Amino acid sequence: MSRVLQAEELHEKALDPFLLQAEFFEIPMNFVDPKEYDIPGLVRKNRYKTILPNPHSRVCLTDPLSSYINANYIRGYGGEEKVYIATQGPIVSTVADFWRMVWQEHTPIIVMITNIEECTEYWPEEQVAYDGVEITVQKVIHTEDYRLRLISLKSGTEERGLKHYWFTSWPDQKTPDRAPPLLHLVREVEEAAQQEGPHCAPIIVHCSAGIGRTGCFIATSICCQQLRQEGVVDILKTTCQLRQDRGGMIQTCEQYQFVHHVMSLYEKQLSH
């Protein structure tokens, strides 16, 4: 499943919703059959009983229930392993598991994708601790597109930095005029990620279920690298690769079209 798009075809493709829905609904969701998991009490760890992590790519935490989190490693451009972790928005019973993941994985960046005009609560006012991890919001930076929290993680003698991006402009209508802020976020996060240097440090992305908006953000990030390196984008193949890693990535046709609007916008920016 591949449809390589040149500049001119990308601009027209983004504006053809009939072709987009034809292509998008041909892509298998690759959801996990719940029988795959036979763990009593697992449904307490899942925000949706049918949105489960594919086993081959699931993030295993350091008792089968205590090692479980609804989260998957996602490959990046070129198939690079563990560039991202896509995860559900933490629930009350998983907030501690979430921060254990952040520390265990050495995650330097969290990206939370919400709409302020209308996904969870787990970051502290000043300080809170979970399973031996002290979170400290040290600074807050408000922009038009997102709020950036600079966070200090302290678990014993060791201290780590963390950047939490709270995107607030996820649109109800996925029209081209709502694309620039997503593209800005993607570009800011990949520059911040490059400042971490050579290090296997997955970027955590989430909202509610960890597949829809999360898949748009990761697919856009991947295709931006593809456009810069190859001069083309293959959103179909990228979406296929994402679904291999986590079932359901990019849930709706309007989300799929939105990636096309964002990439069409970016290609114009790169030509000018």
Swiss-Prot record:
UniProt subcellular location: Endoplasmic reticulum membrane
Binding residue positions for substrate: D172, C207, S208, A209, G210, I211, G212, R213, Q251
Active site: C207
Domain Tyrosine-protein phosphatase residue range list: 20-266
Its job: May regulate the activity of several effector molecules involved in synaptic plasticity and neuronal cell survival, including MAPKs, Src family kinases and NMDA receptors.
Family indicated by similarity: Belongs to the protein-tyrosine phosphatase family. Non-receptor class subfamily.
Protein's name according to its UniProt entry: Tyrosine-protein phosphatase non-receptor type 5
Organism field: Homo sapiens (Human)
